[PDB]
Design a protein around this ligand. Structure first.
Ligand SMILES: CCCCCCCCCCCCCCCCCC(=O)OC[C@H](CO[C@@H]1O[C@H](CO[C@H]2O[C@H](CO)[C@H](O)[C@H](O)[C@H]2O)[C@H](O)[C@H](O)[C@H]1O)OC(=O)CCCCCCCCCCCCCCCCC
Ligand SMILES: CCCCCCCCCCCCCCCCCC(=O)OC[C@H](CO[C@@H]1O[C@H](CO[C@H]2O[C@H](CO)[C@H](O)[C@H](O)[C@H]2O)[C@H](O)[C@H](O)[C@H]1O)OC(=O)CCCCCCCCCCCCCCCCC
Ligand code: CLA
Ligand code: CLA
Ligand SMILES: C=Cc1c(C)c2cc3nc(c4c5[nH]c(cc6nc(cc1[nH]2)C(C)=C6CC)c(C)c5C(=O)[C@@H]4C(=O)OC)[C@@H](CCC(=O)OC/C=C(\C)CCC[C@H](C)CCC[C@H](C)CCCC(C)C)[C@@H]3C
Ligand SMILES: CC(C)=CCC/C(C)=C/CC/C(C)=C/CC/C(C)=C/CC/C(C)=C/CC/C(C)=C/CC/C(C)=C/CC/C(C)=C/CC/C(C)=C/CC1=CC(=O)C(C)=C(C)C1=O
Ligand SMILES: CC(C)=CCC/C(C)=C/CC/C(C)=C/CC/C(C)=C/CC/C(C)=C/CC/C(C)=C/CC/C(C)=C/CC/C(C)=C/CC/C(C)=C/CC1=CC(=O)C(C)=C(C)C1=O
Ligand SMILES: CCCCCCCCCCCCCCCC(=O)OC[C@H](CO[C@@H]1O[C@H](CS(=O)(=O)O)[C@@H](O)[C@H](O)[C@H]1O)OC(=O)CCCCCCCCCCCCCCC
Ligand SMILES: CCCCCCCCCCCCCCCC(=O)OC[C@H](COP(=O)(O)OC[C@@H](O)CO)OC(=O)CCCCCCCCCCCCCCC
Ligand code: HEC
Ligand SMILES: CCCCCCCS[C@@H]1O[C@H](CO)[C@@H](O)[C@H](O)[C@H]1O
Ligand SMILES: CCCCCCCS[C@@H]1O[C@H](CO)[C@@H](O)[C@H](O)[C@H]1O
Ligand code: OEY
Ligand SMILES: [Ca+2]
Ligand SMILES: [Cl-]
Ligand SMILES: [Cl-]
Lengths: 98, 96, 97, 33, 243, 137, 30, 167, 151, 334
């Protein structure tokens, strides 16, 4: 239960944080590019922790929240998905290293 | 077009120690055979029949007794080149 | 040093916004594909050639052998609900190892 | 190699259509005073 | 006398001993005695591959090739019984030694030909009534050429004979028949022929040297394709001794 | 599950007498095994000769039988090949060869018993893992 | 065909380097 | 056409069941159990210590229904072929010639629809963020006030953030 | 010992299972360790002849102390985890071992690297300080401003 | 002004469109050699016996590769760390079979790139700049050294260096995980914090600066035209950005000093990538990631698996399948 608890409160938390970026931006008088930029972590979180298991059989195959658990997630994606071969991952790698 | 190894598994080779083909580690399965007799046996292969293993030169009476005790565990099939080349009877690339 | 350089500061900082944000969005799209197992798993031409031609080897086929190992060796413990029983004899292994 | 032959035209258009787009935009920008 | 540190890295380790050009002597064979080849060394110098005609009615020829696997080609430390036969002929029976080397040569155009250059299980004989090995003695014989890869070898898709997949797993619903020759590995065992022409004899030391020619098949990649015919030419050395 | 007396009861000899080890004996046996043996025998396999493992079934078919305390203790004094045919003290650590395998120099009788105990008990705990190799890791 | 395509694209990129470097908009201080 | 249902049996006449391929796996070993899930046969990778080979276990396959109804096959290569197909579930005859099919699985319209629309939904989220921002921040789209008072953005000057009437 | 003729044993690749030639012909150990044939050590050299590993010495002259030594060194390969679990990365916990050679090599690589960085740092700074601009560009004397445009 | 003096003046001239300099004198030919050889080899090189088991791997486009699968294949395991220039080969065909191009390319490249670093220092000195941009560049450089040189030195063969190709890179990574458990190595983890953090702070800095651009333009024009190259005044308001980000978190977690901020931007990914590089360089000597395989044991002594053990299972799959024909003995010790 704690997994859905964390993932869901986490999702709404992220929504809250980005709303916070908008709210403060509006109060102070700056453009909301920080929020816009934060769209990217939200896309990652949502696709990996929600959409990905929702496509699969169950939550079981979502990432588990831990260091080694996440490593396992990586290795699983290599072995089952050949994820390194995926040009969308490649673009991500280019974006992060760039 | 047939895999000869798979085919050999359908013969007595897939049931017993084949004096003509089986890798030497297999002799560990029964008391008294490994390493001394196993070495003698693989060295003096091939054999036309199982009891020919009793004619190996130099065997002590003890060793003959052990062999007699284990004949039922033994078989002979035609030498399969794939199984005996490469020195594979001594080391077939399988460890744990 | 490098041939080109920024000359516009606004463009520079926008670009610093743009690069990692866009990268993360792209990876996100890929993972949405993996939700459906809609993978970039194979190159079909490579597989046809390699199936027919046992001397054709690339880093792509090599990596597939690695993936096959990962699946076979980690699946039973990683997916206990499946009750995978893989006898030793079916496990993919190279020589000796 | 048995590649998908459509790849060729897919790649060609992939390059030509947007590139041409840019080129049009660039040239008519230069031709403005 | 040269040591390992004199030789190492020079290429000399792949060369067979030669005898002085004064060695035109004769080494007496006592037909009542048993002899032994204590060291047989074969150093290949040319690899020739038979070209394969299109009309199949013309003559096939042997073309030169380029060695690309460096100085890793010689057979050495080969030993075996040297038997005097009823008719005075001598027969070398190979017992053991470093009696094989994988070799890749390359044809014009880029085609690489792998072969197991070998004299495994060499049985070779002279003319009858060899009272002495001389610079006119010569051996002719047969040997075995096992599959260039052995049973455990796995192809790039993980298919093999004693191990590996038994199908093209990347093409799960392909028709299997068309792939049979690639899926079902076969282990070839063929024969080769060799001639040792003795050119030099040190009757004092029991040392002979000369040239050789061998013919054998090349790698068939475990039945995936037809092998080529290969002719290997080179030099050999041997020390005879009473056993 | 716990480490019970039943788990710690192992064959003493071939006649079928048993001995019950203490938890302290078991743990000492584990420590001493790691000290003197595990470099080659980690997990009950044999790195320098994987054909021979420390599974109890393997030990039972040794000559003489090594699937009991006395057999294993004797083995650590005077190791033989699997068929009993040859004494291998010169290449296998043992009390007889404590001069060339110095780690054996400070093993006492009671230690050999503890090590033997560990080797006999561990497969009762780990099942296939003991002597199984990487497949069961 | 694929090879020609790959090498062509690559070659275009190198040509582009040339122009972006030597036929760039000059930075002008103001 | 349906080839019919494959029933595998061993030498002892026990019925064996092929372990079906889970969707996760591009490839899957061929493993046969009894009703109790005990491994009874397989297609080994390393042959040298194989104990469950179809050859050792005398595995046959019989078909019921479909074009192969009433037939039994006993030669290991054939039985193995059908076991390989059996990991995919029911076994069919395919015309692979007409389309020059390559033997590799593709997804259905369900798959493609789902993919396209999940992706578009995700991108459109960004669209909503972008235009929402432009709507609520229209006044600073081209940049911020050149005369932004440092004390409106510094701390404590106003009690309420952004409210100049709360100085 | 089990009766293999190690000299003529053909491995799966076609290269000798135990013995093969180096690129210059010397007889060497086979397997992956083909890469390590330049290795010399007191326990191995007695098996070495003019052409590398000598097969007759291998067949007849291997002493028990050499077998011992080889087993010891093989089972003390400088491989281990950061928490000192000896063995390959996939080895289970049991053996508390990391080789002194690994400790020393890694420590000193790290140190050497950072000292190269320190060299860059202080050399660059020393140059800048000597020339008089380590605190930054003089606004009224900015060198680049007195240089012609690149284009 | 004599010819040597003239040459020196042209070499160190701040007027060359691309700065040459004394480092450039080494850099240019070495980089050209590496680049030309790499392009030719990537397109047309025949298969290379990378692992020295007469099993040639195809890396070039002409031999059945695409952009993703292609590589310049590492030199043969039979060569190990031996120096294999063209003139040590009996023919070019031999050289190509044994993977000589890899050696030519990586030695010329590593040289050229070291000289690239030096050149960064050098131009900084000719221009009256502060000298340390090169130190930033020392982080990717070290990394290159790690995977092309140090790792082969430790493992005894260039055949275990990173292949020059995309899929080859993936192969090297997977095998690296199998043999060193790099994910469980804190230097790799610091590396990940370095590049994740670097990306984060990139987007962060980009977005804050962009958010606080002073209005200079109308809605129909690009905001970028509001900045003019060389203008003396700052183009955004750092006090506004600070007020914003400071309220986002809390005041004292926001920079108000642009120098110390930009220094942070420099330092974080550079230090991180230094650690990643040191990770590769130390795992080169087999000081590997944390091993908690069977670390958790119950009262009886049953192994209780953790995620570490699952990782170990995956690692085992990699280990047993990698280079499937190259191992004869049970331990893969290099
Ligand atoms: C901002 C965000 C950025 C975040 C990025 C995070 C990156 C860094 C993360 C570091 C995490 C450190 C966690 C340590 C976990 C631990 O509990 O560690 C436990 C280990 C010990 O583990 C134990 O190690 C044992 C070893 O066993 C071996 O030894 C035993 C007896 O010793 C037995 O003999 C046994 O049989 C044998 O196998 C067993 O495995 C135990 O089960 C196991 O618990 O601690 C040791 O190894 C101690 C020695 C190594 C410690 C290394 C510390 C980290 C080094 C880098 C830190 C930064 C450096 C920068 C400085 C500038
Ligand atoms: C962490 C997060 C905390 C917050 C951030 C802190 C940043 C700095 C972190 C420093 C480490 C803190 C934890 C220290 C605990 C520890 O280490 O505890 C570990 C040991 C003490 O524990 C003992 O550690 C031993 C380690 O094995 C050693 O001893 C064994 C038994 O004799 C074997 O001989 C084995 O081969 C040998 O390696 C054994 O496991 C013992 O059983 C165990 O009790 O401390 C020691 O060693 C002393 C170590 C002193 C420094 C040695 C530096 C060596 C340089 C290596 C650089 C390599 C590259 C970096 C890679 C990263
Ligand atoms: C060159 C090496 C490299 C690089 C640079 C990348 C880069 C990336 N990988 Mg890839 N990866 C690689 C190699 C690499 N990969 C290899 C070799 C494999 C094996 C196949 C993988 C397998 C892999 C998988 C399985 C996945 C990635 C993903 C990604 C993306 C993750 C983006 C991110 O930051 O998420 C970080 C997570 C977030 C940004 C979510 C929001 C986080 C919130 C804001 C955190 C707030 C926490 C708060 C502060 C509390 C902290 C509490 C504290 C106590 C912890 C990024 C593009 C992921 C991806 O593509 O996602 C779309 C992904 O799922 N990779
Ligand atoms: C030349 C350096 C060096 C080397 C090669 C060794 C090696 C060893 N030490 Mg020794 N030791 C050293 C210096 C060294 N030590 C120093 C300086 C001290 C005083 C603290 C000690 C005190 C000491 C004790 C008390 C013990 C050892 C032990 C050991 C052994 C086990 C090590 C271990 O498990 O560490 C675990 C690994 C770590 C803790 C990794 C630490 C990671 C560091 C923090 C990274 C730092 C990187 C860099 C310096 C920072 C750059 C920052 C950047 C921003 C610039 C091993 C042989 C043990 C032993 O077995 O003795 C018989 C033991 O008990 N050492
Ligand atoms: C793993 C990598 C990673 C982490 C840990 C991370 C973390 C953070 N990013 C933030 C911001 C940003 N990140 C940004 C771009 C990026 N961020 C990236 C990658 C990361 N970003 C990358 C690659 C980019 C490039 C596009 C931007 C533009 C921002 C910000 O503006 C914002 C910031 O302020 O930075 C200073 C902060 C959001 C604070 C918050 O939401 O509080 C609220 C906390 C909540 C809502 C709880 C979230 C719960 C999460 C989602 C699930 C639970 C997680 C567990 C508690 C811990 C699990 C740990 C295991 C996995 C090991 C936080 C420090
Ligand atoms: C023969 C043949 C065929 C061989 C081919 C060989 C081969 C393998 C081919 C390679 C194929 C290949 C390259 C494919 C890569 C594809 C790949 C994954 C690309 C992804 C593309 C994609 C859209 C990614 C999405 C994410 C994204 C936008 C990434 C962009 C990354 C990006 C360009 C980062 C910038 C990197 C870069 C070097 C910037 C330098 C900027 C610069 C000059 C700074 C200097 C500087 C700093 C200052 O601060 C100031 C003040 C000024 C003044 C100043 O100037
Ligand atoms: C039912 C109930 C409970 C309802 C309650 C609702 C309600 C009324 C609550 C009110 C009461 C109350 C607030 C309770 C609080 C409860 C509680 C403690 C919740 C906390 C939630 C939680 C744990 C928060 C975690 C958030 C989190 C982890 C934040 C981490 C922050 C952090 C690590 C930041 C470090 C990163 C950082 C410093 C980045 C700087 C580097 C970077 C490159 C910046 C770039 C940059 C910076 C500038 O600076 C400027 C200048 C410029 C140009 C620029 O480039
Ligand atoms: C397979 C074999 C292939 C062999 C190829 C060998 C080519 C040799 C002949 C080259 C002919 C000229 C070419 C260069 C033109 C040029 O650069 O002029 C541009 C300016 C003009 O030169 C300026 O030229 C001026 C004269 S004039 O104005 O040009 O007349 C002069 O006054 C001024 O001092 C001078 O700086 O040149 C310079 O800035 C100084 C020299 C710069 C050299 C840069 C080389 C960098 C190479 C990097 C290698 C890696 C690249 C990988 C791909 C990304
Ligand atoms: C010694 C020689 C060393 C360098 C030689 C190689 C130099 C190559 C430099 C890239 C030139 C192309 C730049 C075009 C684009 C161009 O001319 O940029 C010019 C642009 C100038 O920016 P300004 O600030 O002047 O522009 C402001 C306004 O134009 C905004 O509207 O620079 C950038 O934007 C930097 C960010 C992009 C830089 C991207 C570099 C990416 C590296 C290339 C990756 C592809 C490799 C694929 C290989 C197969
Ligand atoms: C490596 C150098 C070893 C160390 C250290 C120890 N052992 Fe060993 N052991 C080793 C080998 C190579 C063999 C096989 C020997 C042979 O040719 O027969 C063994 C065998 C045993 C056995 C017998 C296994 C069986 O019969 O199935 C036992 C019982 C045994 N070893 C125990 C043992 C103990 C208790 C050790 C520590 C004191 C120890 N061994 C150290 C290799 C090595
Ligand atoms: C004879 O055998 C003894 C062990 O049996 C050794 O201790 C000794 O070193 C060896 O020379
Ligand atoms: C030696 C083969 C004998 C058994 C026939 C194979 C199983 S069935 C076979 O499978 C093919 C997919 O590979 C289909 O294309 C084909 O229609 C079908 O007949
Ligand atoms: O990964 Mn495993 O360990 Ca370093 O060698 Mn031994 O096998 Mn091979 O040469 Mn490439 O690689
Ligand atoms: Ca003659
Ligand atoms: Cl090996
Ligand atoms: Cl590999």
């Amino acid at each position: 239960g704690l997994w859905t608890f964390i993932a869901l409160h986490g999702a709404f938390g992220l929504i809250g944080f980005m709303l916070r970026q908008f709210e403060i931006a509006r109060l102070v008088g700056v453009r909301p590019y920080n929020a816009i930029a934060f769209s990217a972590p939200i896309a990652v979180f949502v696709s990996v922790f929600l959409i990905y298991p929702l496509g699969q059989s169950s939550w079981f195959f979502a990432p588990s929240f831990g260091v080694a658990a996440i490593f396992r997630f990586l290795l699983f994606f290599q072995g089952f998905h050949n994820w390194t071969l995926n040009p969308f991952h490649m673009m991500g790698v280019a974006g992060v290293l760039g | 077009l047939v895999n000869v190894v798979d085919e050999k598994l359908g013969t007595a080779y897939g049931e017993k120690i084949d004096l003509n083909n089986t890798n030497i580690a297999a002799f560990i399965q029964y008391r008294g055979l490994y390493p001394t007799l196993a070495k003698l046996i693989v060295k003096n292969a091939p054999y036309e029949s199982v009891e020919d293993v009793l004619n190996i030169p130099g065997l002590t009476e003890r060793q003959k007794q052990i062999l007699r005790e284990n004949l039922e565990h033994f078989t002979v099939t035609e030498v399969e080149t794939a199984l005996v080349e490469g020195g594979d009877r001594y080391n077939n690339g399988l460890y744990k | 040093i490098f041939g080109i350089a920024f000359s516009n500061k606004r463009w520079l900082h926008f670009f610093m916004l743009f690069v990692p944000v866009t990268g993360l969005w792209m990876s996100a799209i890929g993972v949405v594909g993996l939700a459906l197992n809609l993978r970039s798993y194979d190159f079909i031409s490579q597989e046809i050639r390699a199936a027919e031609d046992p001397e054709f080897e690339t880093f792509y086929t090599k990596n597939l052998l690695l993936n096959e190992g990962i699946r076979a060796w980690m699946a039973p413990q990683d997916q206990p609900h499946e009750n995978f029983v893989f006898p030793e004899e079916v496990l993919p292994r190279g020589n000796a190892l | 190699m048995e590649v998908n032959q459509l790849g060729l035209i897919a790649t060609a258009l992939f390059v030509l259509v947007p590139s041409v787009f840019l080129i049009i935009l660039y040239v008519q920008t230069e031709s403005q005073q | 006398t040269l040591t390992y540190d004199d030789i190492v890295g020079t290429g000399l380790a792949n060369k067979c001993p030669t005898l002085d050009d004064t060695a035109r002597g004769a080494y007496p064979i006592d037909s009542s005695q048993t002899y032994r080849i204590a060291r047989l060394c074969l150093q290949p110098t040319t690899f020739l591959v038979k070209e394969e005609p299109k009309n199949k009615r013309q003559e096939a020829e042997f073309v030169p090739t380029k060695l690309v696997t460096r100085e890793t080609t010689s057979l050495d430390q080969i030993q075996g019984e040297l038997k005097v036969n009823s008719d005075g002929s001598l027969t070398f029976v190979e017992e053991d030694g470093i009696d094989f080397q994988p070799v890749t040569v390359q044809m014009a155009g880029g085609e690489r030909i792998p072969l197991l250059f070998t004299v495994k299980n060499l049985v070779a004989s002279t003319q009858p009534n060899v009272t002495s090995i001389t610079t006119s003695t010569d051996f002719k014989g047969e040997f075995n050429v096992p599959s260039y890869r052995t049973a455990n070898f796995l192809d790039p898709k993980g298919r093999g004979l004693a191990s590996g997949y038994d199908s093209a797993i990347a093409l799960p619903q392909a028709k299997e028949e068309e792939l049979a020759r690639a899926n079902v590995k076969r282990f070839s065992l063929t024969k080769g022929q060799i001639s040792l022409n003795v050119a030099k004899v040190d009757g004092r030391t029991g040392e002979i040297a000369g040239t050789f020619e061998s013919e054998q098949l090349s790698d068939d990649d475990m039945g995936a394709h037809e092998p080529h015919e290969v002719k290997i030419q080179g030099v050999f050395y041997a020390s005879i001794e009473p056993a | 599950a716990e480490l019970t007396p039943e788990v710690l009861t192992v064959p003493l000899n071939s006649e079928g007498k048993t001995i019950t080890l203490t938890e302290k004996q078991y743990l000492e046996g584990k420590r001493l095994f790691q000290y003197a043996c595990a470099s080659c025998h980690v997990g009950g396999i044999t790195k320098t000769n994987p054909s021979l493992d420390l599974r109890t079934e393997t030990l039972a078919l040794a000559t003489p039988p090594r699937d009991n305390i006395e057999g294993l203790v004797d083995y650590m004094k005077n190791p033989t090949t699997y068929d009993g045919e040859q004494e291998i003290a010169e290449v296998h650590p043992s009390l007889r060869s404590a001069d060339i395998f110095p780690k054996m120099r400070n093993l006492t009788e009671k230690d050999l018993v503890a090590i033997a105990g560990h080797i006999l008990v561990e497969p009762k705990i780990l099942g296939d893992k003991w002597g199984g190799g990487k497949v069961y890791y | 065909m694929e090879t020609i395509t790959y090498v062509f694209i690559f070659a275009c990129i190198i040509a582009l380097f040339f122009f972006a470097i030597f036929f760039r908009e000059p930075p002008r201080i103001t | 056409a349906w080839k019919g249902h494959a029933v595998f049996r061993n030498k002892e006449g026990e019925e064996l069941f092929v372990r079906r391929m889970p969707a996760f796996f591009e490839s899957f070993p061929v493993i046969l159990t009894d009703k109790n899930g005990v491994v009874k046969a397989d297609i080994p990778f390393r042959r040298a210590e194989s104990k469950y080979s179809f050859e050792q276990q005398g595995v046959t396959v019989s078909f019921y229904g479909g074009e192969l109804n009433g037939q039994t096959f006993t030669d290991p290569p054939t039985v193995k072929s059908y076991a390989r197909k059996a990991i995919f579930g029911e076994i069919f005859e395919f015309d692979t010639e007409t389309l020059n099919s390559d033997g590799i699985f593709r997804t259905s319209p369900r798959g493609w629809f789902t993919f396209a629309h999940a992706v578009f939904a995700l991108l459109f989220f960004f669209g909503h963020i972008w235009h929402g921002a432009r709507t609520l921040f229209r006044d600073v789209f081209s940049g911020i006030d050149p005369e932004l008072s440092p004390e409106q953005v510094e701390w404590g000057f106003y009690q309420k953030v952004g409210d100049v009437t709360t100085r | 010992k089990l009766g293999a003729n190690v000299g003529s044993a053909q491995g799966p690749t076609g290269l000798g299972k135990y013995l093969m030639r180096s690129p210059t012909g010397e007889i060497i150990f086979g397997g992956e360790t083909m890469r390590f044939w330049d290795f010399r050590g007191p326990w191995l050299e007695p098996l070495r002849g003019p052409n590398g590993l000598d097969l007759n010495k291998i067949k007849n002259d291997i002493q028990p102390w050499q077998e011992r030594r080889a087993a010891e060194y093989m089972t003390h390969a400088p491989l281990g985890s950061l928490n000192s679990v000896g063995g390959v990365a996939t080895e289970i916990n049991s053996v508390n071992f990391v080789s002194p050679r690994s400790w020393l090599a890694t420590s000193h690589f790290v140190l050497a690297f950072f000292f190269l960085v320190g060299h860059l740092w202080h050399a660059g700074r020393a140059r800048a300080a000597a020339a008089g601009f380590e605190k930054g560009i003089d606004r009224e004397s900015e060198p680049v401003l007195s240089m012609p445009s690149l284009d | 002004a004599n010819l040597w003096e003239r040459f020196c003046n042209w070499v160190t001239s701040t007027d060359n469109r691309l700065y040459v300099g004394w480092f450039g004198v080494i850099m240019i030919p070495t980089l050209l050699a590496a680049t030309i050889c790499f392009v030719i080899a990537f397109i047309a090189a025949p298969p290379v016996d990378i692992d020295g088991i007469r099993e040639p791997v195809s890396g070039s486009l002409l031999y059945g590769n695409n952009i993703i699968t292609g590589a310049v294949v590492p030199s043969s395991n039979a060569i190990g760390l031996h120096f294999y220039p063209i003139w040590e080969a009996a023919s070019l065909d031999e050289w190509l079979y044994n993977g000589g191009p890899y050696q030519l390319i990586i030695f010329h490249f590593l040289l050229g790139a070291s000289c690239y670093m030096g050149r960064q220092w050098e131009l900084s000195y000719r221009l009256g700049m502060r000298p340390w941009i090169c130190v930033a560049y020392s982080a990717p450089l070290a990394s290159a050294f790690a995977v092309f040189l140090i790792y082969p030195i430790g493992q005894g063969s260039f055949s275990d260096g990173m292949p020059l190709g995309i899929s080859g890179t993936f192969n090297f990574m997977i095998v690296f995980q199998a043999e060193h458990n790099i994910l469980m190595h804190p230097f790799h983890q610091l590396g990940v914090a370095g590049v994740f953090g670097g990306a984060l702070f990139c987007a962060m800095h980009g977005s804050l600066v962009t958010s606080s651009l002073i209005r200079e333009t109308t809605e129909t024009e690009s905001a970028n035209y509001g900045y003019k190259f060389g203008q003396e005044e700052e183009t955004y308001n750092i006090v506004a950005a600070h007020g914003y980000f400071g309220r986002l978190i809390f005041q004292y977690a926001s920079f108000n000093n642009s120098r110390s901020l930009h220094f942070f931007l420099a330092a974080w990914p550079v230090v991180g990538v230094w650690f990643a590089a040191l990770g590769i360089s130390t795992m080169a000597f087999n000081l590997n990631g944390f091993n908690f395989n069977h670390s958790v044991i119950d009262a009886k002594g049953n192994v209780i698996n953790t995620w570490a053990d699952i990782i170990n299972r995956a690692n085992l799959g990699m280990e047993v399948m990698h280079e499937r024909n190259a191992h004869n003995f049970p331990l893969d010790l290099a």
